[PDB]
Design a protein around this ligand. Structure first.
Ligand SMILES: C[C@H](C[C@@H](C[C@H](C[C@@H](C[C@@H](CCN1CCCC1=O)N1CCCC1=O)N1CCCC1=O)N1CCCC1=O)N1CCCC1=O)N1CCCC1=O
Ligand SMILES: C[C@H](C[C@@H](C[C@H](C[C@@H](C[C@@H](CCN1CCCC1=O)N1CCCC1=O)N1CCCC1=O)N1CCCC1=O)N1CCCC1=O)N1CCCC1=O
Ligand SMILES: C[C@H](C[C@@H](C[C@H](C[C@@H](C[C@@H](CCN1CCCC1=O)N1CCCC1=O)N1CCCC1=O)N1CCCC1=O)N1CCCC1=O)N1CCCC1=O
Ligand SMILES: C[C@H](C[C@@H](C[C@H](C[C@@H](C[C@@H](CCN1CCCC1=O)N1CCCC1=O)N1CCCC1=O)N1CCCC1=O)N1CCCC1=O)N1CCCC1=O
Ligand SMILES: C[C@H](C[C@@H](C[C@H](C[C@@H](C[C@@H](CCN1CCCC1=O)N1CCCC1=O)N1CCCC1=O)N1CCCC1=O)N1CCCC1=O)N1CCCC1=O
Ligand SMILES: C[C@H](C[C@@H](C[C@H](C[C@@H](C[C@@H](CCN1CCCC1=O)N1CCCC1=O)N1CCCC1=O)N1CCCC1=O)N1CCCC1=O)N1CCCC1=O
Ligand SMILES: C[C@H](C[C@@H](C[C@H](C[C@@H](C[C@@H](CCN1CCCC1=O)N1CCCC1=O)N1CCCC1=O)N1CCCC1=O)N1CCCC1=O)N1CCCC1=O
Ligand SMILES: C[C@H](C[C@@H](C[C@H](C[C@@H](C[C@@H](CCN1CCCC1=O)N1CCCC1=O)N1CCCC1=O)N1CCCC1=O)N1CCCC1=O)N1CCCC1=O
Ligand SMILES: COc1cc(CCNC(=O)c2nc(C(C)(C)NC(=O)OCc3ccccc3)[nH]c(=O)c2O)ccn1
Ligand SMILES: COc1cc(CCNC(=O)c2nc(C(C)(C)NC(=O)OCc3ccccc3)[nH]c(=O)c2O)ccn1
Ligand SMILES: COc1cc(CCNC(=O)c2nc(C(C)(C)NC(=O)OCc3ccccc3)[nH]c(=O)c2O)ccn1
Ligand SMILES: COc1cc(CCNC(=O)c2nc(C(C)(C)NC(=O)OCc3ccccc3)[nH]c(=O)c2O)ccn1
Ligand SMILES: COc1cc(CCNC(=O)c2nc(C(C)(C)NC(=O)OCc3ccccc3)[nH]c(=O)c2O)ccn1
Ligand SMILES: COc1cc(CCNC(=O)c2nc(C(C)(C)NC(=O)OCc3ccccc3)[nH]c(=O)c2O)ccn1
Ligand SMILES: [Mn+2]
Ligand SMILES: [Mn+2]
Ligand SMILES: [Mn+2]
Ligand SMILES: [Mn+2]
Ligand SMILES: [Mn+2]
Ligand SMILES: [Mn+2]
Ligand SMILES: [Mn+2]
Ligand SMILES: [Mn+2]
Ligand SMILES: [Mn+2]
Ligand SMILES: [Mn+2]
Ligand SMILES: [Mn+2]
Ligand SMILES: [Mn+2]
Ligand SMILES: [Mn+2]
Ligand SMILES: [Mn+2]
Lengths: 180, 180, 180, 180, 180, 180, 180, 180
């Protein structure tokens, strides 16, 4: 292949995040060397999930995203069978021990209103909290409850905009924008 | 021997916890390669003790479990001769500098009501606080005082249920359940 | 060259700070081996910026100083396009996520009143917060808002005075004082 | 020499503490291999000073003990010339940025009342705060202001009593007790 | 699944070897949790390849096995376009810079005579050197040229027999033997 | 800028080599973000120099390339004033303690015959040994004395061809080829 | 207990050697805190075995001493079933891949002639090579074949005499001498 | 003090060498901050001793210089009581296990002929081998036996001349030259 986006993803993101994104796509039958926009999206969504759990108190969140599917589910059963929360239909991203709810994290390239709508439709179980992030710098969360501090959310939006600038500086943003 | 449970314990728990459990059983004349259910129980009880001390503030707890008996006692004398607390008859697991009491941690495979009863009977000295944990996800603590935050206790129950799932997934839970 | 001040700067400051100061001066066409007083000033200003961000909460500050100009700007655009703050004319040193403002850090060898005046004149955009530090041990901040705790600011002034003592002990302070 | 106390000190205390105590005694013309009770006392006093600064908030204390005399003084001048505190006649152990005072730490083998008296007599400058610790488990601080939390002070007394037990277990406590 | 062989493979082999074997099987559409005998065979073949390159001089061998297919081929082209050796039809395991030939490593569960025959049939290009190893402790190499020292080959056979003993001790060898 | 070649250089070469190449170009007034082909050439020439010194015995070579000019010269004077070798007019790359001569390493994109000619013309002092390497896989050394083993030189040519394949796979080789 | 010899053993020998000796004695029902002379002898014999394998070429020796009995035997079976050597009746210390024989290492406090005699009597199988070392500085090996270089054996005797001096300097050698 | 030479010594030599030289001078009642030329000479002599032992085979040399006097002697007794070599009157620097002799290393600022003469006069025991090194680049060894390879000795002279250049570049060589 030899795509500019693949080499940018490896230079932009942390090696442990690239490896986890590579393992995730291959597990679902995706090629990071061919479909490089999904490779960039998976790394971005992964890093956002990690910074999110880094916000707030220690051991406040349980990280579901990034684990292989079987083990990622195994933790979901344990959290449900411990706290008494309904089992989600689809795999979520985190669990909040402080608010006792799962969190589905989204990173969109359009307006946050559309992405949340498509997310809340698939998640017919209204118990899982939703928190969308946008590259331009918006965010929409369920019941206007954004969970973390303003400063922790601000760090995420700042990094999101840096990625967009880095892509556009290499003339790869427009392909990534029209990808979603 | 070559038991499935021994290889699972080594793959499931952290190497430092396995070594401490191995040293503990051998010191009391127990074979981790033969009696593998007690090997799994000692690792589980050890990890629960470590997460427990990881809850709350730093240097809030003094870890007694995991040390060799002579040194584990030596610290008990120092804590007693410093705070003026009665010397426990049997070796406890932790000491709470915030609540000024020793803690005996239990991890049971039956209902928490029975295990606490047997624990409180041996500990005729009602000064040592008792905190039981169950694999299914319950907990019973003395005077309904559970010491740590709800989130820290929730992390322990979640990990406890993951261990049960991992055992049952390998068809070793029933032997571990009827072991106690 | 073989200047006493160059070898003192390398012995006084942390290697990562010396490398960042070396990279900064060379990027702006400055020689650390020739103009060693500016070499000492850049290291001092860098270390003060790092301790400043180390004060307060984690992820409270975004460190702009120390990055290469293109990337240092890139983060400024992201912070502006995320929080809605006006773009500064000149490169600042940090950004406060808690107070939503950029910070320009100064380390002067004269009275803090003059240095602040020259700083506020160049920064015609009154939105960027200014915080001056002096070697003797004073500080002047915009609107008397010194941002960090008294203890964190005290640590900075103490280190500043240690550097002056170390220079004067080697008979290099007077050259550094009349340098500015 | 080949003293039991020297090998106990090396086995009991952390290597960085032993090296700092060795460097301290040699600087003052003392032999750790000959006068092993002073070797044990210097290590104990050093470790108590380190745990003390580990109590409370980060960067709350400035550690004076453990540095070589010239640099230990250099920091004292900087703290005085920054906060406006009188220069102590004798070298103190720490400085409290929160309470704006120097701390002299003592570890005695008799009752804390005597040791404090001898300490307050030498320190005719009543500005430096005094905090005595005893092996048996007492403490006396100036104006009954013990600075740190009860839990942090309790950790120090517990460790102090463990050292006494370790010495007595090797029949070296009586020599250490009649040493002071 | 929860197979005894999967947990044995993770406990028996080095983590970097397990990860490389996991990545290899998934790339070829194989499940290490389901087909655990091939999981053990891939780890064994990988470790044998690594010890083989560890024999002899440094930089004597170029390791082809363990790399992802595209990069593993890329190195083959470079070695061919540098030394002038014919391009192998199938991916080999190593390249010998000292003897200027590729090496195909085999680890069989039957007699080495059969495995070599099947290997030499697929490798119709007689230029690639073949070196078979057996669990019981035999070896067959092309033209009786075993490349490495007797001591380095002996270390490989010893480790091979230890793996067989470890499997048989857990009653998993017969399934692994009848697997091939 | 945002060039594909810059991100490839950072992904292809080791971080310490990229930093040394960056420092080298900036010192000579070159921009690695603009003139990315020279950025790739400097990294390649650096890595070839490092592998070259890695060949043969330990401490056989003194690495001149990679150091800043003033210190790189300083070592040249020491080697000359120690062994009695004439001072080279231009900065060489290594020094051979075994053959008592400096080595100038070249990595060309045309035939090795031309590059050596231009190299030997500038180096009018015929004492400095010359060793050219080509991407396609040739090498020309002074007096047919190639210094290192055949296997060590083969490793260099193999890596050289891998870089060419990686560039061509990303459609950046032709620009790099017509660069020289 | 609190013995001078126990604290000397911990200060004299490497932590990994002390842990292996502790695990060895406990496995055979021995107390390192009570029988401290056997604790010193096991550490000494262990360190001698490790330096012995460090002599000569890499991977020349297979270390049997230091492993737990079951695994130490497992390797013996593999070495026998690979090289065709008779199975030793008692556990040896090393295996020589170069000379194809097991080695029994001895460290005596009397003359090497007696210790070898008692060793060769128990080892009725004359195939296992014997190599005795003495604290004073002698050595006796089977068939006058001392296996390693003179320099490697000299390093062992030098360290052996340093241990004797360290013990005698603490007035513990005579108890260790009359122990055997 | 604040001497240019002290800060140069700390910047020129490795931290472990500076610490060992500091400990050596203080042990003999010397101040590295006052007598900085002896501080530079001790570091230089130490580094030369370390490179010397780094020459040749592994474990060929026993390093005596750098240890504290009591332990440095202890090893000398062990080497003598093991190999049967006469005890040196003064402390040597190394011991050669290959040539069975102690080595006294010298680093002079005058001609090597004088320094060797003064060295051989004090060492009336003609058994200890002598090897002098000069800053300008000469060497004189007993019986013209220079022990190590030409390349290893050349590395030492090259580093020696680099130190002289670094001193002269800072106008501190003349003081160091007239120091001896
Ligand atoms: C726990 C471990 C990996 C974690 C992944 C995640 C990464 C974390 C690393 C931290 C440290 N920082 C921050 C600064 C640089 C760095 O390095 N962050 C957060 C920000 C970006 C990043 O990288 N975290 C969080 C806990 C500790 C840790 O490392 N993951 C992976 C998915 C599940 C999980 O918990 N696990 C768990 C088992 C397998 C494995 O590998
Ligand atoms: C102190 C030391 C060992 C401690 C054991 C315990 C382990 C701790 C490790 C932490 C870090 N985490 C967390 C993430 C992974 C990791 O690694 N946790 C807690 C969770 C599971 C775990 O593993 N703790 C607690 C203090 C620091 C430390 O390490 N122990 C052993 C018994 C007594 C004791 O205090 N000691 C003390 C002397 C001997 C020794 O070894
Ligand atoms: C993040 C990383 C480097 C950081 C520089 C800065 C240094 C920090 C180091 C800390 C740890 N301490 C404190 C004790 C000793 C030590 O080591 N401190 C603070 C005090 C002095 C010091 O040294 N910080 C802050 C975050 C973590 C870190 O390391 N920088 C450089 C400019 C931008 C930036 O964030 N980055 C970012 C990308 C390139 C790079 O290198
Ligand atoms: C700063 C550095 C050394 C510090 C000494 C002190 C030691 C500290 C180590 C911590 C980490 N813990 C705790 C767990 C094990 C461990 O390791 N603790 C505290 C408890 C016992 C201990 O050991 N601290 C405190 C700051 C970080 C650090 O390391 N010192 C020495 C005197 C001055 C000083 O600040 N410095 C400063 C310059 C020279 C040097 O070496
Ligand atoms: C180079 C690197 C990984 C290597 C894999 C291989 C592993 C090697 C590790 C050595 C060290 N030992 C030995 C003792 C324990 C240990 O750790 N051994 C050999 C014995 C078992 C083992 O584990 N080697 C060999 C060179 C250095 C290295 O690590 N590989 C993977 C396939 C290609 C390759 O060269 N690479 C290369 C790029 C990706 C990556 O990861
Ligand atoms: C010495 C040090 C840096 C060296 C650079 C060079 C790098 C070497 C690293 C080795 C280890 N390998 C090999 C496997 C991965 C790795 O990491 N190799 C060789 C192959 C590629 C590579 O990276 N070498 C050689 C000696 C040890 C060392 O590291 N340099 C830089 C120029 C001068 C010099 O000697 N120095 C010296 C002072 C400043 C500095 O940084
Ligand atoms: C392999 C590993 C442990 C080894 C023990 C042995 C220790 C070795 C350490 C070396 C490095 N040096 C030398 C300088 C300081 C140091 O650290 N030396 C030799 C001299 C003293 C010493 O300490 N060796 C030898 C191979 C690498 C290694 O570490 N052992 C323990 C018994 C079996 C074995 O092979 N293993 C194997 C599985 C369990 C484990 O732990
Ligand atoms: C053994 C240990 C310290 C040694 C000192 C000496 C230092 C050695 C370090 C090597 C690695 N290199 C080389 C590259 C950078 C580096 O780091 N070199 C040699 C060149 C300069 C240098 O620094 N050596 C030699 C053996 C391993 C070691 O480290 N010493 C101190 C005196 C006695 C002794 O043997 N010891 C022993 C007990 C106390 C202690 O600390
Ligand atoms: C698939 C699943 C994965 C593992 C990630 N698992 C997810 O559930 C997940 N994956 C996404 C991504 C970034 C993938 N695609 C994306 O842009 O969002 C749409 C989506 C949502 C859920 C599954 C697949 C795609 N984003 C989420 O927010 C998200 O929760 C990897 C590749 N394909
Ligand atoms: C014995 C003691 C040990 C050291 C652990 N010391 C304990 O006191 C302890 N050990 C347990 C375990 C898990 C062992 N067995 C168990 O399941 O609990 C029953 C028990 C309680 C106390 C001693 C022995 C068993 N559990 C506790 O809660 C506990 O406090 C190891 C092996 N045999
Ligand atoms: C230039 C810019 C740099 C990078 C640093 N960037 C800065 O903006 C900056 N640089 C300074 C320094 C210490 C440099 N000189 C100084 O003493 O202050 C005057 C100053 C201010 C801004 C730019 C240049 C000099 N100090 C600041 O406070 C400061 O914010 C390096 C060399 N020359
Ligand atoms: C001297 C000074 C040192 C450096 C330590 N500096 C001190 O000031 C200091 N040293 C002590 C010690 C434990 C030494 N002796 C002791 O037991 O206390 C009496 C004392 C007090 C001050 C100086 C010397 C001794 N204890 C303190 O509390 C203390 O503050 C080392 C050796 N001799
Ligand atoms: C200049 C010097 C440097 C430092 C490198 N110093 C060199 O002497 C050097 N630099 C080269 C490079 C790869 C640069 N250019 C190149 O392709 O070779 C031509 C060359 C030779 C010498 C100086 C400059 C260019 N190659 C050599 O072989 C070589 O020895 C960096 C940038 N510009
Ligand atoms: C037992 C076995 C061990 C494990 C060590 N295994 C040995 O085989 C062994 N153990 C020795 C020691 C030093 C123990 N005792 C000793 O001094 O030698 C006599 C001896 C020999 C064999 C077994 C036990 C003692 N020495 C050897 O040379 C030796 O090979 C530990 C404790 N008791
Ligand atoms: Mn997800
Ligand atoms: Mn998501
Ligand atoms: Mn317990
Ligand atoms: Mn318990
Ligand atoms: Mn700035
Ligand atoms: Mn500034
Ligand atoms: Mn003090
Ligand atoms: Mn004190
Ligand atoms: Mn193969
Ligand atoms: Mn060059
Ligand atoms: Mn070159
Ligand atoms: Mn043995
Ligand atoms: Mn033995
Ligand atoms: Mn000397």
């Amino acid at each position: 292949r030899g795509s500019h986006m693949e080499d940018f993803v490896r230079q932009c993101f942390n090696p442990m995040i690239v490896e986890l994104a590579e393992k995730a796509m291959k597990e679902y039958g995706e090629d990071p060397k061919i479909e490089t926009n999904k490779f960039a999206a998976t790394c971005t969504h992964l890093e956002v999930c990690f910074m999110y759990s880094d916000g707030g108190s220690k051991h406040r969140f349980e990280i579901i995203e990034g684990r292989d599917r079987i083990m990622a589910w195994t933790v979901v059963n344990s959290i449900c069978n411990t706290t008494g929360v309904e089992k989600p239909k689809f795999l979520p991203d985190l669990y909040d021990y402080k608010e006792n709810r799962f969190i589905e994290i989204g990173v969109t390239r359009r307006e946050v209103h559309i992405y949340y709508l498509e997310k809340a439709n698939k998640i017919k179980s209204e118990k899982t909290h939703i928190h969308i992030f946008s590259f331009t710098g918006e965010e929409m969360a369920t019941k206007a409850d954004y969970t973390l501090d303003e400063e922790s959310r601000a760090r995420i939006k700042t990094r999101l905009f840096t990625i967009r600038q880095e892509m556009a500086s290499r003339s790869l943003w427009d392909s990534f924008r029209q990808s979603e």
